[PDB]
Design an enzyme around this catalytic site. Structure first.
Site, PDB file in Angstrom:
ATOM      1  N   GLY A 188      -3.873  -1.358 -99.900  1.00 57.12           N
ATOM      2  CA  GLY A 188      -4.673  -2.309 -98.789  1.00 57.12           C
ATOM      3  C   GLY A 188      -6.187  -2.025 -99.183  1.00 57.12           C
ATOM      4  O   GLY A 188      -6.495  -0.734 -99.092  1.00 57.12           O
ATOM      5  N   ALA A 189      -6.895  -3.016 -99.411  1.00 56.24           N
ATOM      6  CA  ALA A 189      -8.322  -2.817 -99.720  1.00 56.24           C
ATOM      7  C   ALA A 189      -9.143  -3.694 -98.962  1.00 56.24           C
ATOM      8  O   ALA A 189     -10.235  -3.832 -98.914  1.00 56.24           O
ATOM      9  CB  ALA A 189      -8.681  -3.214-101.321  1.00 56.24           C
TER      10      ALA A 189
ATOM     11  N   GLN B 252     -11.051  -3.480 -94.541  1.00 55.83           N
ATOM     12  CA  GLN B 252     -12.137  -2.408 -94.100  1.00 55.83           C
ATOM     13  C   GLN B 252     -11.406  -1.037 -94.074  1.00 55.83           C
ATOM     14  O   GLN B 252     -12.461  -0.158 -94.265  1.00 55.83           O
ATOM     15  CB  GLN B 252     -12.498  -3.003 -92.798  1.00 55.83           C
ATOM     16  CG  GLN B 252     -13.155  -4.774 -93.074  1.00 55.83           C
ATOM     17  CD  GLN B 252     -13.886  -5.056 -91.672  1.00 55.83           C
ATOM     18  OE1 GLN B 252     -13.090  -5.443 -90.891  1.00 55.83           O
ATOM     19  NE2 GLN B 252     -14.940  -4.996 -91.572  1.00 55.83           N
TER      20      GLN B 252
ATOM     21  N   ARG C 294      -1.729  -7.775 -85.521  1.00 56.68           N
ATOM     22  CA  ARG C 294      -1.201  -8.643 -84.578  1.00 56.68           C
ATOM     23  C   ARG C 294      -2.369  -9.847 -84.006  1.00 56.68           C
ATOM     24  O   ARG C 294      -3.450  -9.442 -83.592  1.00 56.68           O
ATOM     25  CB  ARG C 294      -0.820  -7.995 -83.226  1.00 56.68           C
TER      26      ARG C 294
ATOM     27  N   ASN D 160       5.540  -7.945 -91.658  1.00 57.52           N
ATOM     28  CA  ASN D 160       5.075  -6.589 -92.238  1.00 57.52           C
ATOM     29  C   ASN D 160       6.289  -5.651 -92.638  1.00 57.52           C
ATOM     30  O   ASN D 160       6.026  -4.968 -93.527  1.00 57.52           O
ATOM     31  CB  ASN D 160       4.164  -5.767 -91.215  1.00 57.52           C
ATOM     32  CG  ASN D 160       2.901  -6.173 -90.952  1.00 57.52           C
ATOM     33  OD1 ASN D 160       2.274  -7.256 -91.765  1.00 57.52           O
ATOM     34  ND2 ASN D 160       2.109  -5.749 -89.967  1.00 57.52           N
TER      35      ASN D 160
ATOM     36  N   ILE E 296      -0.662   3.361 -91.991  1.00 57.21           N
ATOM     37  CA  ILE E 296      -1.483   2.642 -91.006  1.00 57.21           C
ATOM     38  C   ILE E 296      -1.511   1.178 -91.008  1.00 57.21           C
ATOM     39  O   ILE E 296      -2.248   0.532 -91.208  1.00 57.21           O
ATOM     40  CB  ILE E 296      -2.870   2.872 -91.162  1.00 57.21           C
ATOM     41  CG1 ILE E 296      -3.278   4.147 -91.825  1.00 57.21           C
ATOM     42  CG2 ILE E 296      -3.786   2.355 -90.040  1.00 57.21           C
ATOM     43  CD1 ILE E 296      -4.790   4.437 -92.294  1.00 57.21           C
ATOM     44  N   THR E 297      -0.037   0.872 -90.982  1.00 54.65           N
ATOM     45  CA  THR E 297       0.375  -0.571 -90.802  1.00 54.65           C
ATOM     46  C   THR E 297       1.151  -0.676 -89.411  1.00 54.65           C
ATOM     47  O   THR E 297       1.943   0.152 -89.236  1.00 54.65           O
ATOM     48  CB  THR E 297       1.359  -1.122 -91.897  1.00 54.65           C
ATOM     49  OG1 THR E 297       0.935  -0.739 -93.315  1.00 54.65           O
ATOM     50  CG2 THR E 297       2.041  -2.619 -91.728  1.00 54.65           C
ATOM     51  N   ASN E 298       0.859  -1.629 -88.801  1.00 57.88           N
ATOM     52  CA  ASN E 298       1.271  -2.041 -87.370  1.00 57.88           C
ATOM     53  C   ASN E 298       2.579  -2.692 -87.231  1.00 57.88           C
ATOM     54  O   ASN E 298       2.847  -3.743 -88.145  1.00 57.88           O
ATOM     55  CB  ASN E 298       0.437  -2.507 -86.551  1.00 57.88           C
ATOM     56  CG  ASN E 298      -0.711  -1.493 -85.999  1.00 57.88           C
ATOM     57  OD1 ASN E 298      -1.953  -1.762 -86.159  1.00 57.88           O
ATOM     58  ND2 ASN E 298      -0.147  -0.560 -85.548  1.00 57.88           N
TER      59      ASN E 298
ATOM     60  N   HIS F  71      -0.050   4.492 -79.116  1.00 54.52           N
ATOM     61  CA  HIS F  71      -1.022   4.041 -78.579  1.00 54.52           C
ATOM     62  C   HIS F  71      -0.657   3.383 -77.235  1.00 54.52           C
ATOM     63  O   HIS F  71       0.334   2.827 -77.011  1.00 54.52           O
ATOM     64  CB  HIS F  71      -1.828   2.976 -79.276  1.00 54.52           C
ATOM     65  CG  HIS F  71      -2.165   3.514 -80.799  1.00 54.52           C
ATOM     66  ND1 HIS F  71      -2.879   4.631 -80.879  1.00 54.52           N
ATOM     67  CD2 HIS F  71      -1.942   2.951 -81.935  1.00 54.52           C
ATOM     68  CE1 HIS F  71      -3.172   4.953 -82.308  1.00 54.52           C
ATOM     69  NE2 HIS F  71      -2.590   3.952 -82.877  1.00 54.52           N
TER      70      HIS F  71
END
Ligand SMILES: [Ca+2]
Ligand SMILES: [Ca+2]
Ligand SMILES: [Ca+2]
Ligand SMILES: [Ca+2]
Ligand SMILES: [Ca+2]
Ligand SMILES: [Ca+2]
Ligand SMILES: [Ca+2]
Ligand SMILES: [Ca+2]
EC number: 1.1.1.37
Lengths: 318, 318, 318, 318
Positions: free
Chosen positions: A9-10, A12, A82, A95, A118-120, A175
């Site tokens: 994943g590139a 931000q 999301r 996902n 760090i994928t939701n 979270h």
């Protein structure tokens, strides 16, 4: 060889991971994404920055998993965020297929990697990625708690007017409403926050408001940016995890980790404090809860169980 | 007080400047842009990252110039980029008005700042910003050459298979066709590139190709990213300039600087090697040219003169 | 495992090496010396410092070579310094026996190490250490030139009033009268010192005086300290070499290196610019001399040949 | 101007302070001692190291207090150590006269300095130095507790097998039998040591042994070195204090600080947690003691009172 970090994943966060890894001289970096262009552009831009501080690191961009071969660390940010108008089920739907593809590339080409997801939604995606990839459960973790800890430390350092270096925040879980803060294990210079209220250094209402601000912290940033989500704090958080692995630091960091009976839980990824070293998740630190905390933790684990049920309902392999 | 760095423009370069300034513990940071939201979001996101490495820095976002008051350094990225379908004149048209507004905020609120401009077209915008603001000419500079130098060093380090720390690139002028490289004053470990060709460490054709790649380097990144331009190397370059000012390092850096007769030029900003210290541009290093270089430099200064004529034709104050 | 650095000799340079290796997070450190006490004390003192900056590194002291097992880098400072009243032959006599003992410990316990020698007289002791240990010639180097380069850069940065980051010094050979400086390959921002005299940035007499000050530089420090010799600059110099190996930086550094025909020399260690990477001395950069330089180099290599003859005359194995 | 750090005493701690201040780019450094030679030698040696990492800092040595003029921070290591065969009274006797001379130089030449004392016996010498110099009480502190904290953190990190970054040690008072540790305010990742015993991560006997090792920690190093005392950890500790002042970090650090009624004490220097910022000692953090701790603290303050009585008995001015 220098250590090799692959970034799946590139966007931000990915770009910021790549920049931090250079600045911190952690090793060589491969940026991966599905379409050529952005990975190669960001890689070359950071490579071109390197002479200014003097870091020696190879940077490349790729859209083939062969490029991640032998990666010591893989950090996954692939997938969609999301939206305003999509369900948890459609997010999970899209996902999970991303995790299947990613997991198969890691399985084939970096099976010895330490993998940071760090994928939701985080607690579900990391569980899925581990299952799809087949990697050892101690070698796959999710970044969440370090970020909540970092935001809460910022708020605390503000409130007390002290260095960020002398504040500690203790969080478990996920979270938002699934976060489980322990303010009694959060400190300034070793003094628990609960005791700082008794000393008059803050108030109960201020403390409660900082805890709630931590819960809401990702949305706070989204509301300000309007397009897109936080990326500096999430990237710094994941790099702390990666560095602990790469340098065998044995940091104690709250991370989504596979539980083999710790905290009374088996077979789930849950946000807990873990020792990260060269062997991956080396130990889970299982604290003793008071009543309010046990109830908060159980609620938060029920939320995770709910997510995993939803994953399973939309995927045979799981 | 800690040093104060104001960043006028909170886009990708601005955000990266803000992150670098934290990581390098340069001081407190104010992100400015015309509309609330993004500056405050990026500021808070970086603030929230800070506990992870332990930097103590205040971050804020603002849309009022009063917020930059007393800034020790101001870095300007405000304005628009050159589009696919707009003229140099319309770019100059829009961005000159941006410089007028910026210059008036600096004049009122940070008149003692060292100002680093990175709005395009650079040699014209910095000249304009100095005029609009009224600040001393030695206190306003443009970032350009450090970026070209950084890209050329990367290409050279690749070609020779040596550390980026042991390569030096000498450039003057602007970007692209206005760049004036001196390969004889570019070195590996002190050995000029011209001598490395004689040793067989590279070839003339390879050297010429790296010089051309440097000329084209910004576009190369644009072609890869498809949306937007480079930002990591530009931000690192400007931070090197800012750090030399803040820490009185007296780095010798190629920057767009006001010439009071050096290089035979009076009253123009041109890319030249300057000593940057606590008093701003302290000295210009005026090298002796060979014939090819003198002709290249004169062409490049004629290009600058052309730009300034165009600015003047669209603004009474100039 | 983290990287492992063994330091043979726990005197002022050894201690400073150990401190730098911690601060720079290069790996775990073993301090060795012949008598227990000082190595263990310095190790524990640095270990105890570590929580203040947050470096994670194991430190230990030892008087058995088994403790260096598997060291990735070994840095040798063991031996005696040249006294007021002892001959070159008695120095060589004592320190060769030290090299035999050290070389046998490295042979047995860290045969894959990259070895950096800083026992005097340097060009002879490193040659001897390589022979005694049997390690590959590309894996054993001597620290000398980086130190002379560092001192000359300091003097130059002073003289020009510019950052130490923008000065390059080119030296070959050994120290003192055996140093071979090339002021034409020494630069400020890529501009040779010879050209800076023509620009009036310095004078020929000032330049010559800085070259002579570099030659005398070790004695200058000895005359000030009265007891003992320099140790901060020597330690920083060797750590730069070690870091280039450990991080595969491919720095180009003047070091005493084994010549297999480069510079017209076979079978001797001579101070030359070498590329240091993960494979040790990877390439020698052989420059083209002018007449004065060729004569200076030949004199300096004759001095080395003289030293090696003296070693051989006092040791059968050599 | 860059910040200016004056170091009064150029022994092993002084030299290490000077090296750290360069590496950390804190500013320019003046090394002072009573006899020329060593200060100038160490200064030049560190100056000569600087090109290797690229720090720009002026270094000088001096034996006249005029050289410290305008110092932003002064760190005092001058004086003699406690010998095998001298009384507390003779130590106090000699070192008080040192403090008088030092205090008069600071008064005349750096009256706005933040002063950090590391002359023994610490709690008395800092009290004396403040009185002799006349500087504001909030601008003069003693280094002690950070060192005890650093040693205890090292022992704890060892025992738990975790990063030094995730351990906090809470100490008050002085060294040795005058140390007042609070193991309940000492933590791993926010979890108090007292709770880690309950979890079985260590034992009570191991915890007690680490506390005792901390008490004995300076002597442990002395017994190993045989000549001289610790210097790396003491220097790192004082630099943390200096950096908090210079960069306005507001670290919370246990330091000997002047009490204006905090902890029930008036007019004495005692080891307490203080906030250090650009205004010096900004706030004292006064914790609530349990019974054992109150008794330990009272004993330790009685020891300080005893020392001050002894100072007064040998000096009219005090
Ligand atoms: Ca470096
Ligand atoms: Ca359990
Ligand atoms: Ca820090
Ligand atoms: Ca001229
Ligand atoms: Ca760290
Ligand atoms: Ca040859
Ligand atoms: Ca630097
Ligand atoms: Ca009180």
């Amino acid at each position: 060889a220098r250590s090799k970090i692959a970034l799946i994943g590139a966007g931000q966060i990915g770009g910021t991971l790549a920049h931090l890894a250079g600045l911190k001289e952690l090793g060589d970096v491969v940026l991966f994404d599905i379409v050529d262009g952005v990975p190669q552009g960001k890689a070359l831009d950071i490579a071109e920055s390197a002479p200014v501080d003097g870091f020696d690191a190879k940077y490349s961009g790729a859209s083939d998993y062969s490029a991640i071969a032998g990666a010591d660390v893989v950090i996954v940010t692939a997938g969609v965020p999301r939206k305003p108008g999509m369900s948890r089920d459609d997010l999970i739907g899209i996902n999970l297929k991303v995790m299947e593809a990613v997991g198969a590339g890691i399985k084939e080409h970096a099976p010895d990697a330490f993998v940071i997801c760090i994928t939701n939604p985080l607690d579900a995606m990391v569980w899925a990625l581990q299952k799809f990839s087949g990697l050892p459960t101690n070698k796959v973790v999710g970044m969440a708690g370090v970020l909540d800890s970092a935001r809460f430390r910022h708020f605390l350092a503000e409130e007390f007017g002290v260095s960020v270096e002398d504040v500690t925040a203790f969080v478990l879980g996920g979270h938002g409403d699934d976060m489980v803060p322990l303010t009694r294990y959060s400190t300034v210079a070793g003094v628990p926050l609960t005791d700082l209220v008794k000393l008059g250094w803050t108030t109960q209402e201020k403390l409660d408001a900082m805890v709630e601000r931590t819960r809401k912290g990702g949305g706070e940033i989204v509301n300000l940016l309007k397009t897109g989500s936080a990326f500096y704090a999430p990237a710094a958080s994941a790099i702390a995890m990666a560095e602990s692995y790469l340098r065998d630091k044995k940091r104690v960091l709250p991370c989504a980790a596979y539980l083999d009976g710790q905290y009374g839980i088996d077979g789930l990824y849950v946000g807990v404090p873990v020792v990260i070293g060269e062997n991956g998740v080396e130990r889970v630190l299982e604290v003793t809860f008071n009543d309010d905390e046990k109830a908060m933790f159980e609620k938060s684990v029920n939320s995770v169980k709910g997510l995993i049920e939803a994953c399973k309902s939309v995927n045979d392999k799981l």
